[PDB]
Ligand binder design. Structure first.
Ligand code: W41
Length: 165
């Protein structure tokens, strides 16, 4: 199962790891994708997860959007995890770079509570533009299920652990 994680709280764990490499190693029940409302997996975590599936995630996502329309910011959908996990929980955190309400980050993390254990990135962090320290705080204060956070950047991982209240 999950190895090398630092325990932050009763249910939140963190590791400096590439979430794609982590998913291929663990093959968890649920891998969280840092999705956008259109499920267009172009860059950041979404582009990396999609590239690991040889674009199968994008093909499946386009069929999902054709049938259902876009997700809401703060919302999610469960799709296949392909070669990475049993399922992928595509969660839309607010993109601060697209002027979205950072207050929707708590709503985005609430989606994690529908799954007993998840491998996940910090929502709205990276190319989504939010402060990752704030994202970790919202995560620990919102998620009650077991969440294994993979932080790609070593320097950001160190800052997150060393500043964790
Ligand atoms: Cl290739 C790659 C892998 C992991 C990751 N996390 N954020 N961006 N990113 N990109």
């Amino acid at each position: 199962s999950f190895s090398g994680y630092l325990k932050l709280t009763d249910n939140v764990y963190i590791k400096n790891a590439d979430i794609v490499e982590e998913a291929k190693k663990v093959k968890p029940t649920v891998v969280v994708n840092a999705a956008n409302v259109y499920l267009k997996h172009g860059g950041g975590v979404a582009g990396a997860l999609n590239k690991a599936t040889n674009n199968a995630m994008q093909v499946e996502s386009d069929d999902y959007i054709a049938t259902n329309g876009p997700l809401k910011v703060g919302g999610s959908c469960v799709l296949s995890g392909h070669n990475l996990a049993k399922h992928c929980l595509h969660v839309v955190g607010p993109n601060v770079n697209k002027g979205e309400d950072i207050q929707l980050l708590k709503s985005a993390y609430e989606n994690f509570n529908q799954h007993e254990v998840l491998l996940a990135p910090l929502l709205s962090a990276g190319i989504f533009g939010a402060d990752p320290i704030h994202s970790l705080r919202v995560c620990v204060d919102t998620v009650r299920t077991n969440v294994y956070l993979a932080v790609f950047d070593k320097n950001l991982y160190d800052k997150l652990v060393s500043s964790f209240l």
